[PDB]
Amino acid sequence: APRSVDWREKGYVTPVKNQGQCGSCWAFSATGALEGQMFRKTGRLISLSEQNLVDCSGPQGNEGCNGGLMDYAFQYVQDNGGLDSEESYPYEATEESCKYNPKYSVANDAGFVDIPKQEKALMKAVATVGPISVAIDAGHESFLFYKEGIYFEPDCSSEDMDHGVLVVGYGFESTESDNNKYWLVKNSWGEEWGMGGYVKMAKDRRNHCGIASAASYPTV
């Protein structure tokens, strides 16, 4: 695989969004992955409606602002036959009744692919597919205050994840400890968090924060 990958430079990635005070990170992760795969297919980058997922994908198992899963979101898009654009179905950070309108659908998928729970497999997926939906253990103050560099939290869990995010690439930089590899991760806490909304998560360090434990992408 390549040593460095950044799908932002290929046009696959929309700007950083902000989920607010709603537990809807799974929806932002899913829209990020579907935005990348739709661009791969059509060459058009169109921001997708997280609110559509929050309001409408309960039957696939999601629970709105109380949590959900990216795979359930991909299943909704397939079962529902579409997903509205962000412009047409804007984000309100609160769960409401479903207002999906197929006339404004701009995305589709035919299912999803779950990646084996290994960072080596996640690397191959990122290198060949595009941005990948992942879940991480973000429940640490160090993550809130992250500003730059490679994020490494000794107390991070590799099994209990609480936050869906999007891997848009990976790379390296020289560090004091010579743990130099990172996943380039798009968060949904706005651009004031981290590095313009992004974090460099430790890569190849025992599946740090569980980044390879629940990785998937939609088939387009």
Author numbering: 1 to 220
Sentences from the paper on this structure:
Here, we have further investigated a potential dual-targeting effect of Calpeptin and, indeed, show the pico-molar inhibition of cathepsins by Calpeptin, its sulfonated prodrug analog S-Calpeptin, and the chemically similar prodrug GC-376. Binding of the activated compounds to Mpro, CatL, CatK, and CatV was characterized by X-ray crystallography and their antiviral activity against SARS-CoV-2 was confirmed in cellular infection assays. All three compounds bind in a highly similar manner to the catalytic site of each protease.
Residues involved in the catalytic mechanism are highlighted in stick representation. c Surface representation of the empty active site of CatL with the catalytic cysteine highlighted in yellow. The active site of CatL is formed by two loops of the L-domain (Gln21–Cys25 and Gly61–Leu69) interconnected by a disulfide bond and two loops from the R-domain (Ile136–His163, Tyr182–Ala212). The catalytic dyad of the active site are Cys25 in the L-domain and His163 in the R-domain. According to our X-ray crystal structures, chemical modifications of Calpeptin to enable interactions with the S1’ pocket of CatL and beyond may increase both overall affinity and isoform specificity.
